């Protein structure tokens, strides 16, 4: 068994974490438990604290606007590791006991119970090179020696570890996505009717997505082209919540449906990161530092949860759009669009132990 360790720049205190990815179950999050090793001789009267912080960044690392930082702290939890506060009665995890046994008596535990309804680690890809700092939600564990909490804390006497709050695909599959639409343009005759569906609801990253499309063009109006697209929606909720849109994958077939006819087909679209490196602000899964990440996983939420979850909420839909070519007495080059939306879940399977 291995543990992750980091040390202060002066090397006095060092933080040990059993792992750096913490699974966020909908009901509760796995607690962040760890150990801090100090030396009471260095701390004449100082106290070492550990804080867990959920930081969301609005934009680029630069101030560049009036000298202010576009960085909110959505969640900050703090604990006084040393001296061991007699006030609390928190028990000791098995890994914490093993670390305290391994290290000396100068090893003191810390534990953080992350509350539910908090965002996971997502990073907004900025497309081309503009800044060296990523944009999105992150979780940070910060150990520091200080006389009191309200104090500017020295950078050589503090360790910071980036940890991960992750979610995995639900154990049980959900209902098969499906969508319907019945549309008539000038109400001449029986209308155009589009029906789309997916093969399943939960897909894994890299796995192809099959869209079964069925069109009954009962009117006299020809449809020329059919676009299937996989689109990522990033609800970046903040003060005055917004929503982001990005077409992640696309297949634009030139299949035509004659008037008063029928057309059934299956389109296979695979979303991958190779062709989405030029799209600024794309929700990526948010690794620890610059590393190999992928398109952000769908954020799972409770059925009766607070709709105003701060941070980035990721969703995925498949838009099936029939472009019906328009023209009557005067033949214009404009055309109408009949579209359906199929929501789906794009997640990582739970690791097998």
């Amino acid at each position: 068994t291995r543990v992750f360790k980091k040390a202060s720049p002066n090397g006095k205190l060092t933080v040990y974490l059993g792992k750096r990815d913490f699974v966020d179950h909908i009901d509760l999050v796995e607690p962040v438990d760890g150990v801090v090793l100090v030396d009471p001789e260095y701390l004449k009267e100082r106290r070492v604290y550990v804080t867990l912080t959920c930081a969301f960044r609005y934009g680029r690392e630069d101030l560049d606007v009036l000298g202010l930082t576009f960085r909110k702290d959505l969640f900050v939890a703090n604990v006084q590791s040393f001296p061991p506060a007699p006030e609390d009665k928190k028990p000791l995890t098995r890994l914490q006991e093993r670390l305290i046994k391994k290290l000396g008596e100068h090893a003191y535990p810390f534990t953080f119970e992350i509350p539910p309804n908090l965002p996971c680690s997502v990073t907004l890809q900025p497309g081309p090179e503009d800044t060296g700092k990523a944009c999105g939600v992150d979780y940070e564990v910060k150990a520091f020696c200080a006389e009191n909490l309200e104090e500017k804390i020295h950078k050589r006497n503090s360790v910071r570890l980036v940890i991960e709050k992750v979610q995995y695909a639900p154990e049980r599959p959900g209902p098969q996505p499906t969508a319907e639409t019945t549309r008539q343009f000038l109400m001449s005759d029986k209308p155009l009717h589009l029906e789309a569906s997916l093969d399943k609801e939960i897909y894994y990253h890299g796995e192809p997505i099959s869209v079964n499309v069925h069109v009954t063009n009962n009117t006299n109006k020809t449809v020329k082209k059919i676009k299937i697209s996989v689109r990522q929606y990033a609800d970046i909720c903040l003060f005055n919540t917004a929503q982001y849109k990005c077409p992640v994958a696309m297949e634009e077939a030139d299949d035509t449906v004659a008037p008063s006819s029928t057309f059934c087909k299956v389109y296979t679209l695979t979303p991958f990161l190779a062709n989405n490196r030029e799209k600024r602000g794309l929700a990526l899964d948010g690794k620890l530092k610059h590393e190999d990440t992928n398109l952000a996983s769908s954020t799972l939420l409770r059925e009766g949860a607070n709709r105003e979850i701060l941070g980035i909420i990721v969703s995925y839909k498949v838009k099936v759009k029939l472009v019906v070519s328009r023209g009557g007495l005067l033949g214009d080059l404009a055309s109408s669009d009949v579209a359906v939306e199929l929501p789906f879940t794009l997640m990582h399977p739970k690791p097998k132990e």
Partner: antibody
Framework: VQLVESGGGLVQPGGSLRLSCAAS????????IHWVRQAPGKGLEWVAS????????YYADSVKGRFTISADTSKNTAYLQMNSLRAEDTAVYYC?????????????WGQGTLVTVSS | DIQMTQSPSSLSASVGDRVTITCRAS??????VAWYQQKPGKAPKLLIY???SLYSGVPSRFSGSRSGTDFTLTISSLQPEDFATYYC?????????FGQGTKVEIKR
């Protein structure tokens, strides 16, 4: 669930080949494809690797510039073009697959094709 | 570039004996070490990954272990079908390097 290699045979030094690895049961975007060669009476030596999810492509320092690995994602096939074949390229070439997300070793391997560069 | 050294280069054991193969890494690969088994004329088969995790379907007699940069594959009760060449790959860094191989042979 299967990898099938083809395209190996007798060559002359300075010639070229094109090995194809057809992957059945695998998605080129949820898995990375590697080419690993074993010299006659020697150990395994990794040659090339392609990751279609990222478009990443890696080669060993002994084959850079000469060997190029590509993939036809529609057919789920991986190709290795070998140019300027030196006499030290005689080997058996296996196409192996690994998980794209959390690589956990080369789970699946093909039967391997013999490449002989004797003059 | 990491050189992985396997010991012994070849060993002769008998059915039921406990076989141990050692693999030393030049640099420090954290746990990205896999153990593979190749029989003559056949493609290699993954036996263990992450230096401890048994691959699906591999018999439980095979076990991996790590101590620092020193990894070990142990077969508890050697069987006649468990006599082949064993390789030690490290997939922490590019390129991925394999060991020279240990050929387990029968004892007479």
């Amino acid at each position: 669930v299967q990898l099938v290699e083809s395209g190996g045979g007798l060559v002359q030094p300075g010639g070229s080949l094109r090995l194809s690895c057809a992957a059945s049961g695998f998605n080129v975007y949820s898995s990375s494809i590697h080419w690993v060669r074993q010299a006659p009476g020697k150990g395994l030596e990794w040659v090339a690797s392609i990751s279609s999810y990222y478009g990443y492509t890696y080669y060993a320092d002994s084959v850079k510039g000469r060997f190029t690995i590509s993939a036809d994602t529609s057919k789920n096939t991986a190709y290795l073009q070998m140019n300027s074949l030196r006499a030290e390229d005689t080997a058996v070439y296996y196409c192996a697959r690994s998980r794209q997300f959390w690589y956990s070793g080369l789970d699946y391997w093909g039967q391997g094709t013999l490449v002989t560069v004797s003059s | 570039d990491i050189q992985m050294t396997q010991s012994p280069s070849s060993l002769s054991a008998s059915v039921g004996d406990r076989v141990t193969i050692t693999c030393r890494a030049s640099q420090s690969v954290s746990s990205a070490v896999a153990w593979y088994q190749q029989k003559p004329g056949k493609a290699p088969k993954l036996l263990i990954y992450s230096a401890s995790s048994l691959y699906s379907g591999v018999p439980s007699r095979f076990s991996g272990s790590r101590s620092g940069t020193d990894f070990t594959l142990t077969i508890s009760s050697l069987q006649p079908e468990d006599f082949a060449t064993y390789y030690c790959q490290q997939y922490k860094y590019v390129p991925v390097t394999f060991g020279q191989g240990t050929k387990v042979e029968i004892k007479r």
